[model samples]
Target: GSHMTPKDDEFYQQWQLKYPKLILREASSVSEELHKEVQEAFLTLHKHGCLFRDLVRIQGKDLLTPVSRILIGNPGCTYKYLNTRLFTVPWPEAEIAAACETFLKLNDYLQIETIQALEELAAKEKAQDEVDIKSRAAYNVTLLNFMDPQLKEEPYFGMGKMAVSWHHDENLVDRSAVAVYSYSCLEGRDPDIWHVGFKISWDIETPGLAIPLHQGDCYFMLDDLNATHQHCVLAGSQPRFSSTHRVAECSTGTLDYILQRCQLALQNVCDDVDNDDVSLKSFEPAVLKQGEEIHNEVEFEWLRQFWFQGNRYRKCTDWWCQPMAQLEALWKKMEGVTNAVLHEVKRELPVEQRNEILTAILASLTARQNLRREWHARCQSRIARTLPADQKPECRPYWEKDDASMPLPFDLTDIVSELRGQLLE
Candidate 1:
């Protein structure tokens, strides 16, 4: 879907002096024990179902990133990633919520190092004078992680497609640096090398370089890297996770729009009670009557600010439709790449072990497709059970008729039956 072509030669050489390089921070930067702890903390969040997939609208077509992820940090600002205004949710689990704090703190620590790296790179490249640096704001943290289900079964080649697609860091502050930490579960388990794919600044269509990221490795994209070199998550045969820290300054317009949405959500919550006795001014989960342990008022006190809790849906039907749109975006590209991989494998490998390898490849695809659907269903069901019926409409008109009449992105009745009874496996 990316249309990067060849470019002019003299212009390409002149591009080298710009500040668009990626600086690598190895696993040795932090202790092995700390890496284990962070790994365990994020794994706990995954175990508790805190992570989710985002439907990113790039080039006017909505695409679903295969990585199921979430944002966790200061709630004062929201990062407008694509069409989604990603906010830090108050995760209910104590361990996960605490890890959320650790992640936010980790972002602060990495951000300082990233700024240092940016200055160094700028000076090294003789672009120090041109650089427009700003005093850093509180960083917005996004935790993105996903597993390749076929990695374990195949034991050889990767999924033959991207875990994340090619695109620059969109909606981030101008000339800002993003510090990211990598975590994974490859301690003698999976047989795959996860790499961060980087493209040439001037001409990206050529065969790009792959920087393999081991567990605990950190990297910073300084200056024009997010501007010039488009990057993507290359195919990996293992679970890969990243905590990316960036600055997202909200405009007055976005802030006011967010304020109105929050007000309506608060009004809906108040309307559900139907009682004048409970005061919202004392708002520490006053609407809840269960034991206090079930609801940590102090940790989730931030919930009063935004209604991006329970489910990130404007309408109840989005539970099904949003993911379907996301899935088709993923699967269509998936299907095309898969055919190439399958054909390529058949041409090279001997007939003796071909069947086993092919099975593993298809198995991996099916498993990942199943995982995405499974996550969306789990997310939707949770909202149905917890949210009040009136607020959780089958299809609430959030845009006063503007969110109405969206294209049938998920209405696939005619073509879906073509497969009939065949399972992905």
Candidate 2:
């Protein structure tokens, strides 16, 4: 179903007519020459301690603990989501730079089509302004997701599974004005094992487009597509390594400028230590590396203070922090409940009864979500009492600010009754 072309499906034909401005294209394969270069860049980046090793938030309580990645770009670039912020590392040396240049060039070709599509849509709308196709291929940031099949959740627990929930690339403040180009360079994996796909609907019950992204194939997402659609990679049997590049407004600085900025950041930290801002010493570069063991108390304290107080844009608050701490504890409890339910069903139930057990799990998760919401509200209300009279405490709406929707609650008795005949047969 994934390899299906646009011509093969009448529904696709009808849909294409409906959204004439949307563009999705796939190339057969990228050149092997550049492919080798990308692999080299990957290794070089890993060597430089560029990969992010911390767990990324999955949902309210769930997390992608073993999903390591890196955000590399020009100076002052950063991406933020769900209590995590990733800053751009200085671009690697000449060897890596050459390969990355080729990578960007490939995306340049893909961006052409996306640019034209935007122009077409704008023309149809008959806006007063004209759209420019020039500089359409320009992007300075590359988010490299190192999806290793061997990476596990824990040594004793089990293998790490990859599951990127439905979301958009629109979380950043000033993300990209252009489209996105995602290319995969798989390692020790077959193209058929796992395929990348995108869907328009956020709801699971609705049907939408699912296009496969094969190895070396570049998938182009048209500008503003993230505003409407939620794309994801369907779970697969093997590892999936890919890079998604986009032009951010912060990607405006030059290489030297970026390097100087990093130097200044380090310089400021050193200055803080000299002034005895806290009972901490200096910052360590190794702390930034993946799997680096930071043992010394002074070093640990330094890292904590540096992270919390360093960012000038946003300060850590009790409202967000306190709720997260409680939610994490509650999440652990709910996770056990979920695991127990699945384990019980597997051991005790027949194939037909499995759906019934899953429905129960869904309700359990919903209840857990409601509890988390209550604690969050409590935290906000506590913070609100301390706020200045001029500024009232506020909670943003989940849809516009957007909290994900819960599945439709089910009636267990009705579900059991309906499934009884099927189970008997």
Candidate 3:
């Protein structure tokens, strides 16, 4: 099974400061009136249309269009379709034919030029055994608003693509290192081709056009930050062409097109990262939750460190897996001094209520007290064995004594009382 930790705000803070290229934009705001109308319309369509079709239009199409249309329609939507005649990209005809020719020429199956298969493989690989809320959210939102009822070929669809741009702004520049996502859904159709995700950045020397619907496929650009831009092309769709330089500098430009002749669907929700099993069929969060413990005490404790103002050393956080024990200590020890006072209150409560409260008290205090004693003893032993006699003085006093600076006990009462106050029926 997969595990999901809450997103780290520290990572976001660091990203904002480090990458000046592209920023991850927030999902569009949905008004209550619009949400109600959209929900009702989707329900009606779900009853009449194919379940799969209805699904795509609602999540991908519907959700994306309203947002895209708003952005494009706004005076601030800087870029427009600059070349009307070039609307239909030239890749599906030339690139596909070239790919086929090259494949035939290499008859030994030595080379394959089509990126559709590769892109699908990449998507499946990245998504393997992971619970991806962004993809699921994007899928649900896209399906509702995929088709353009008024347009020919439903060209104005709002389905989101993984937007990777090397623009001047942070949102447009750094698509990797983070998932730089944005989507829009009007009436279940394609969004304004240009404004679907993060905004574009270009100077006169280099202009990144949205790849036409035939040539591009979703793949990582391992080149320098300025060297490339890419986005995902859904399976079984037309390719798209966009204008962007190979790198951030305006030198070598290519009319690169992302390929779309693809196939793959939300087959299943998977739990094994290396397996082919679809997990969607058995996705029950409650069942998953029952088997797992939600331990956010440390995460919550970390929050206390933040001011109604904040600090820089903690902001530029990198994504790294931390040992659970260290994380818990960093969080709980700082604010646990008053845990004893709360425990005292539990002893004086009414009999029936006190029993329930007593269970909670023992679960926390007993474990915490035992853990504290064990931890201090272990620290002293480790310090003796690991550090030299000369260096021992620096660590020995802190480990051997009951330092008031450290929180050896946990304060559950303070938190419980606060929670009780907020959770009133």
Candidate 4:
């Protein structure tokens, strides 16, 4: 009860003041010089054929939606029902990675707080002596893509998917900005230039707003844009590339919660795929654990900071060993957090024996290893079809539960023992 969460109105008004309704900078928001960079970045990412098809479920059926996508950035975890679409593709090559860095910088210029927008509108010729004020609600996850209207896609009952269907983006953070940039190289026929249009609502008669961006032109929908309008891309002759960036739910809070969940998973990994045994997970759980490593060189540092400080480990040549590497990395981070907690707990309970607290910490760490082993075993059992479903709330099949933790590197028991001994000495 110590935490005082702010009421809705306070942050709501503050968010509005920071990011205005519609920040529209088109055709020339990006200078010709920067425009060239945008083009190069787009081409670099596009040429590598990093595209992957995404599936959408309709009426309990999954269909591959038209228009392939390249997902970049740290795609955070989710629990929304039927929301298995995030991070479906592996990381691309270094070239693609560099392009993403540049692309993200371009997006930086479009936030409502960008000096370009603030200064341009601030300049006044007539009576008003102009002043300016300066912001994505912070974009981390970017969705890159290319499309052609001529590219055909079939839907049932003459519902051939042509252009992007009208729907609001549903997975972004509350009141976050969704910025879209365009690069068209294939066709831009004057009379039929392809465009992105928005309707007030699905069934409304209003003609709605249509934005036909060209070259490096960009537009951003701040705050409630997705909440207010249903937007779609109209069919176009032009072959186009779009870099859409937004602040998804990959927040520190999400990762923190995930770390907490991982702890519980380590503790509660009871009854593997086999009902015969208790405590541990298998290969699938390994995937589940490493799946949340958004801790790149910059962000997601909270959970991984100490882990990266002078960390060392082993490597081997094999497929399963590769996944085991991820397990080591994840455990290092988790162990880093666990050790930090031990230190703090020691200071908090200075009256207690330090080794005694260390004893409890090491015990928990060992239990977690057993949990990871159990996870690995459960996945193997399910894969070999040697087990039955006994999970609660809703029962998922073997492969489904398989998508969830990983192996430990070395023993935290011994590792902490060495540290405690050295520190005491």
Specify the highest-TM-score model's number: 1
TM-score quality measure for candidate 4: 0.52
**CA lDDT of each candidate?**
0.49, 0.42, 0.25, 0.46
Q: Is candidate 2 or candidate 4 better by TM-score?
A: 4
Which ten residues in a row are the worst by lDDT in model 3?
67-76
- Runs of candidate 1 exceeding 4 Å displacement: 1-20, 56-64, 90-92, 126-138, 151-160, 186-191, 205-207, 252-257, 260-394, 397-425
Runs off by more than 4 Å, candidate 4: 1-20, 75-82, 88-92, 112-136, 151-162, 186-191, 251-257, 268-425
Select the stronger candidate by lDDT from 2 and 3: 2
Residue lDDT tens for model 2, 160-228:
222454567744323133343334432222333444434454443333444555555555555455555
Ranking by TM-score: 1, 4, 2, 3
What lDDT does model 2 reach? 0.42
Better of 3 and 4 by lDDT: 4
> By lDDT, is 2 or 4 better?
4
Q: Tell me how many residue pairs clash in candidate 4.
A: 14
lDDT of 4 by residue, 1-425 (tens): 01001132243343334323545567665678677877887777556655544433456454455675655554232211123334312222556556666766675665544444434433531133222122334555667777755644212112123467767776677756677887776121132455665555543443344455667667777557678766666555677888777666554334445455455544423423422123333223233233222212111222222121111111101122243344344444443334344444446444345444454444444444453343333334322232122211111111222332212233344555664573465
Tell me the tens digit of each residue's lDDT in model 1 across 166-276: 667766776677778887652121226666666655564344545567889887777667887777665555677788877655552133343443343233132344232
lDDT of 3 by residue, 237-271 (tens): 22222212111111111111100000011122232
The C-alpha local distance difference test score for the whole of candidate 3 amounts to 0.25
